[model samples]
Target chain A: KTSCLMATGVLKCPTDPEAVKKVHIDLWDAAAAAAESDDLMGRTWSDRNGNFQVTGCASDFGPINTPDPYLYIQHNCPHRDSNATNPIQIDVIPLFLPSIVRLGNVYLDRYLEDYHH
Target chain B: KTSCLMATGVLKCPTDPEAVKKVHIDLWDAAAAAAESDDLMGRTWSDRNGNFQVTGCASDFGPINTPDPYLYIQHNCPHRDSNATNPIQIDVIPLFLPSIVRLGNVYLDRYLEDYHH
Candidate 1:
């Protein structure tokens, strides 16, 4: 099964979702804050729907390597222009672990199951 | 040692950097493309300094969860305004895998050794 494995070397499960989620949240805040502090780029935070929303500029978006690499969030942000039709909601779960060969599928599958379970 | 582990259930290393890198690149491209096509947000792509740079707006950057999150790039982007003293180049390697408790440090160490070595 595709499991949401943490750097802690454990699969992410509902049993301890907060811990897993916290790790990710903390990382996001730290990285994003550092960039903003240096004025390297701008980031926005919102919780319109009670879901924590953090947005960073292009310079800080992407998987590891290249430039400004960081993790990807799974949901869409509220439209900057409220008039803009709600951007299509997509769940490219598999895309998140595309390079992962062995536990790639397993990771992807388990992520959806465990994260949203 | 912290290792850069991919979803394929393998560690990212110099031995096959291209493959590992490609996986990440592909994932970013695919995800970004989807968002753009839907007009969900805007992403910028550049190859200045012989380094491929891809930037996504606030709505698409983070370490997963909350809003339109995508993976992060590791290098500072060419300044939007040349006059601004170059933004400090910072590498919070550990930030990428903060939630990864077990292999967290290991992945961080290996990522530096392999990706930079």
Candidate 2:
């Protein structure tokens, strides 16, 4: 049986709110077990209120299956990697998704400060 | 007069180290004073050891001025946002660059964990 996973979130850029309003985000099926084996489920941009939703799926074999997912955000916020000089940020979600996931309000400020798993 | 800036760095993907082998990177002149006013300074890929170097410049006027720079990286690593179900990353450098800068060895493992201007 094939199942679908949906995730939604509201992103805010406190210092540069507009940066969050129309940001591009990508949802993927991160097949951690293999190299170069990720699948894109959905991609969209945030609205005026910094809201976004993505839906995607991946099939499993061996009599059973579950979905693994992650969300990647691209924004032009104040917290850039610059040395007057340089920087970047990336993310990965390593877990099985329930049918739906709601990421409430995410602040692009210090996002990965205490992130794990 | 126009001045040039140079930057060099090495990247490594702890989990999938090779993911950094040939990654695409873009260096930009982050003109923070305005919106959507970034300029492409350099673009290149990492070598086997994930080593990359980029050089670029911008002209200054009104007696004196400086350069604003940022480096954006695109990688396919393990820490991706995936629920088996769904990710992407981007960057910007905001400060004015000196003549040259070096970023030693950058671990692609959890780069943005401690990023800022």
Candidate 3:
């Protein structure tokens, strides 16, 4: 088994070439699946060095509780570099929380009850 | 004179027709300016009811302190609705704060100084 370092939401692929390839494939598969469910506008392709890259855009930026509308992934082959491969990174961008989102049903109930009295 | 309510991140435009138009223009201008500097992918147009809307995408997602790469705007003319002009909302989406961002220079100084000793 191979181990990779983790930090800042980025996962460093193991030095082993096979391990790095696995990381790239896993992220690519996840992005493809997410694209189907959300109105995520995106594409996947290999770069000149054959690096796997994926991107997605949200159709709309909803409230904070809403899931991220954007998807990002950058995976580089371990063989590309000698000292170390750039970390494999993937994550969703979060939108600002709307005020309505901050005020949950609990607050609504209190307001309704108070106004009724 | 007219005053609309304010809630969450959304701003309720003034009921006055003129005020609503001003709000729409302001948000449109900001989106345009933001697009120029950032690789913000977006478009601005008037809807059927002549509502002004804008959107942008960040070219890359950076650390938590990094400014939002996404721009969103939804402004409606006061004339569209009698009860109230839908609130004019504009904001940038936030990305997850990477662990590195959470550790500022303060931590760096400690590690460097401690390791040196």
Candidate 4:
């Protein structure tokens, strides 16, 4: 059973719930694929957010397919070394990301259960 | 008993009264001719006011030779460290100190009493 972890934070995404749902499905897919690695602690903060200060973790993470309220992505894909992989270990929770010029709505305490049993 | 450490901070001299008494009699005649040393803890806030955060002190002391309203100087003169040596040290108390940038009269707390002790 692979469990997904969601953090409560400001998210920048499209106003449409359908778009958010599509992205949410995609994250689960990636998380499932990335559950195989040990070093794949998940995607790094920098990889997902482009921040120098936030690094560590080795996931394929990032670039939500649909624009959202906040810029977020994932990291830590144990099996993949070079190319981008899915099954991210950790997802980024953008706080003050620059590219996110406007915020739509931020979920306060988003939690995650098992996306795949 | 060799003690001479003064740091009142709020000084940038030159306002008469005997060029500040021939620069306080040339800092007690260059601290009695560089009181033989062990990295003499005698001078440095950037050398009487240069300000590189201020460096470590070792003293052959400084140059008031005479004519003063502030810009004081002094540094450690170990028996022989690197270049010059009077006992070891160079004395150049001027530079905003980019080079004796004149600033007349400033003494706060107006404190310190040991002129003729």
Candidate 5:
């Protein structure tokens, strides 16, 4: 793989789905936590419909190695600091991903359990 | 569109890739936040390899309606409360989903933007 990467998704706040409009998004190459840092591939923003598309490139080791990508979303919802560093991260792992990863609809403020403690 | 639900995936903590083993997973019917609560369709735990599969059933309104599904993962990664209610929610929209939704690999501690402030 030549490090050419692309991803797509819609950001939502199930608590307030439409609140995700115009949210900032970053596309990244998520390499293992090693001496080398993960690379940022592209940037975009959600539209009025909370939709976004991002594509970027990085230098790869070769066909044996490709980039693992994810979406980093920044939005203003009731969960003020939820994604400050707790971004609604999505892993579009090309390990099994197609050329383009489609995350469909994502909720930035949704929770697994009520564990705010 | 009967409420026969099924999903599969591996849970991981990119922070501690092996930590997601045996974690609790709840598959829920993501209905609107109305008086009626979202239904819990299935429950299972990640295996030693962090893999899991769950299936369940629900009654549907008709052909025009289907259960909007999501995975509710409960993990003990460093970010404990991060997914309490802050679950690493995945909307496997048969709105765009297949008979069995595949979530691939998920990181309980992966932040989209590190917004924990």
Candidate 6:
């Protein structure tokens, strides 16, 4: 099994090919999923990796060489209107050192409930 | 497209071959999603054909089988406190299961921000 290692950034992506392998990150996979429904305009995942994939976008910023494993996804949340469903975005940061995938910047607890499994 | 199948247990899986096809289940998908996020407790996605799928969880509980097909995933949210993003949880009661998917657990809102689509 893999573990999570914190990296430095609101959004980070693994650079090492090995890190990419063990770590499966999807910072935006959820919101990406949510946008599918709540999106009043109806949304679509970006075929252009630069838009959603963490390695695709954040990497564009610089070298995210870290020793840990985590996935960083960016959700471009929308305005908070009572009657409005917001737009969503996704990204991921793969952590290698600790070797675990993770969610980056999205508040998922607001709508969903929790239980002890 | 396929639909969702709700079963029983703190978790569940799809029964109808059709629902299994279209609507993807992931109740813990988020907390399953978030457990991945800020789970200081650490976590893993379930593949035991139970625990995370909406059709898997709700359907097992009964005929959650709704017409609107609004994916109704249940989140087993944990206790809350400061310095705690909270124990994340997730589930998806695949709509069309609505012919759409949604976030069902671990307040995805409090953490995620709103941005323009």
Of the candidates numbered 1 and 2, which has the greater lDDT value? Answer: 2
Query: What is candidate 6's lDDT per residue for B4-117, written digit by digit as tens?
Result: 223223232222222111112222222222223321111223222222222211111123222222223222322122222223333324333223243332231222222322
Assess every candidate by TM-score.
0.19, 0.40, 0.21, 0.15, 0.40, 0.19
Across A9-31, the per-residue lDDT of candidate 6 in tens digits comes to 22212221121111222322232
Clashes of 1: 47
lDDT of 5 by residue, A14-39 (tens): 66666776566766666522316546
In angstroms, the error of model 4 at A74 is 52
Q: Judge candidate 1 against the unseen true structure and give its global Cα lDDT, from 0 to 1.
A: 0.23
Candidate 5 at B33: error in angstroms?
A: 6.7
- Candidate 6 segments exceeding 4 Å error: A1-86, A94-100, A104-117, B1-50, B55-117
Report how large a share of the reference interface contacts model 6 reproduces: 0.00
DockQ scores of the candidates: 0.04, 0.02, 0.02, 0.01, 0.02, 0.02
Q: Which runs of model 3 end up more than 4 angstroms from their true locations?
A: A1-12, A16-73, A80-117, B1-89, B93-117
Candidate 1 on A1-117: residue-level lDDT in tens?
111111111213233232222211111223334455321221211122122222222223323221232233332222233422121221222222122212221011133333465
> What tens digits encode model 2's per-residue C-alpha lDDT throughout A1-74?
43445567888777677776656565655552233443554444565678766544455554224545667776
CAPRI-style class, candidate 4: incorrect
Residue A112: error of model 3 in Å?
A: 58
RMSD value for candidate 2:
17.4
How far residue B44's Cα lies from its native spot in candidate 3, in Å, is: 18
User: What would the TM-score be for candidate 2 when compared with the true structure?
Assistant: 0.40
Per-residue CA lDDT of candidate 5, range B12-115, in tens?
Answer: 77656666765656666655323264365545556567776665444345332456767777666655444432456666666322355777877677654567
Q: Output the number of the lDDT-best candidate.
A: 5
- Ranked by DockQ, the better of candidates 1 and 5 is 1
What's model 4's lDDT at A34? 43
User: Which residue pairs of candidate 3 clash?
Assistant: A99-B8
* Candidate 3, B34-71: lDDT as tens digits: 54542323233221222332222223232322334332
lDDT of 3 at A40: 28
Q: For model 6 chain A, where is the 10-residue window of minimal lDDT? A: A39-48
